[PDB]
Amino acid sequence: DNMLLVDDAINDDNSVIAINSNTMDKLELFRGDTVLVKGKKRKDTVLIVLIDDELEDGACRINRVVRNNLRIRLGDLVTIHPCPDIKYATRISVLPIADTIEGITGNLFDVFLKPYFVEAYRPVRKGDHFVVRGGMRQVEFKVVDVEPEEYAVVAQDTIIHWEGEPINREDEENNMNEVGYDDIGGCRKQMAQIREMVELPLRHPQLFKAIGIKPPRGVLMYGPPGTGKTLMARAVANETGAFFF
Amino acid sequence: PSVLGQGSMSTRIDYAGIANSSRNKLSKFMKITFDGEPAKLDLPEGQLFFGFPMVLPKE
Numbered sequence: 001d002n003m004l005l006v007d008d009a010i011n012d013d014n015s016v017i018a019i020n021s022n023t024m025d026k027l028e029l030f031r032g033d034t035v036l037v038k039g040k041k042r043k044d045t046v047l048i049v050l051i052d053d054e055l056e057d058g059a060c061r062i063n064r065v066v067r068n069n070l071r072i073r074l075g076d077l078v079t080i081h082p083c084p085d086i087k088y089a090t091r092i093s094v095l096p097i098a099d100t101i102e103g104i105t106g107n108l109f110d111v112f113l114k115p116y117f118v119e120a121y122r123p124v125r126k127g128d129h130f131v132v133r134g135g136m137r138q139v140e141f142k143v144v145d146v147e148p149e150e151y152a153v154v155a156q157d158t159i160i161h162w163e164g165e166p167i168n169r170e171d172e173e174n175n176m177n178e179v180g181y182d183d184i185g186g187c188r189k190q191m192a193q194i195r196e197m198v199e200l201p202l203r204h205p206q207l208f209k210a211i212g213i214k215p216p217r218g219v220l221m222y223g224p225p226g227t228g229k230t231l232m233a234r235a236v237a238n239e240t241g242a243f244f245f
Numbered sequence: 246p247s248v249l250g251q252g253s254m255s256t257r258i259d260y261a262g263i264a265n266s267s268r269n270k271l272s273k274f275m276k277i278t279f280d281g282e283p284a285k286l287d288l289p290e291g292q293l294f295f296g297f298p299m300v301l302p303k304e
């Protein structure tokens with residue numbers, strides 16, 4: 001029962017996900033418990049479980065920040081598992097987003113993060129984001145580094161380092177290629193042929209051991225220039241999740 | 246002797262500190278060896294430093 005419908009959370013917490021009481025019973029959880037939620041491709045995070053009777057069976061509430069982090073939209077499906085082993089981050093470095101600090105003066109740390117981390121115990125993970133509203137503005141922050149790794153809790157013992165260059169928002173997608181199967185159209189048979197020969201030897205390597213064969217290694221794609229061959233290879237590599245070179 | 250690594254102008258310019266920083270060189274929120282990577286060690290005009298660790302001949 002780890003597949004739940006996505007709903008727009010009313011609250012303004014980026015590390016809180018609401019579940020139905022029947023769903024909470026099925027998942028065998030408690031109010032305030034932290035659970036790991038995995039969405040599309042290889043993106044996942046941790047959220048604080050909340051009890052919501054108004055939520056219908058097989059439904060959950062997540063704010064827009066969580067959906068953006070998981071690369072999902074409203075009404076999608078995610079996989080939720082218990083996360084009781086999450087520990088406390090002894091030392092975390094976090095830097096603001098450049099476009100969110102346009103002319104904002106004063107100690108951004110005390111102004112924004114300190115109210116947002118006064119015994120909040122919000123679970124954090126590498127690459128996560130969270131928006132904090134201070135005064136009449138809102139500023140986003142990203143999980144630049146955490147110790148111990150990977151996912152932990154930002155408690156009082158945590159030491160926050162807010163010194164570093166602003167995180168320009170454009171480079172997250174301009175200088176990086178995060179493309180999935182949804183970015184490829186008009187070529188389904190070729191995509192299936194590539195996947196059945198690339199993912200299967202890696203995602204499920206014990207099948208070939210069971211059947212006692214050595215799957216083919218090399219794969220030569222060719223076609224007219226401009227048909228997206230490089231894009232197809234990038235998408236397959238990203239979806240597989242294995243290290244790509 | 247102590248001056249072969251830890252002497253005058255070795256503490257004024259923390260060669261050990263620079264060496265350890267170069268070894269663990271990251272923003273990230275004792276022995277010196279010549280297997281690693283160099284780090285810039287700039288000194289103003291007119292200063293010489295002969296405190297680099299000795300290596301002895303090849304025997």
Ligand SMILES: Nc1ncnc2c1ncn2[C@@H]1O[C@H](COP(=O)(O)OP(=O)(O)OP(=O)(O)O)[C@@H](O)[C@H]1O
Nearest residue numbers: 183184185186187224225226227228229230231232
């Ligand atoms: N399904 C698709 N088929 C073809 N092109 C696509 C597809 N989806 C997107 N595109 C766009 O088509 C262009 C393909 O450029 P790209 O260089 O990746 O193609 P290519 O022919 O495989 O490259 P090359 O042989 O130069 O490495 C890009 O703009 C890509 O965004």
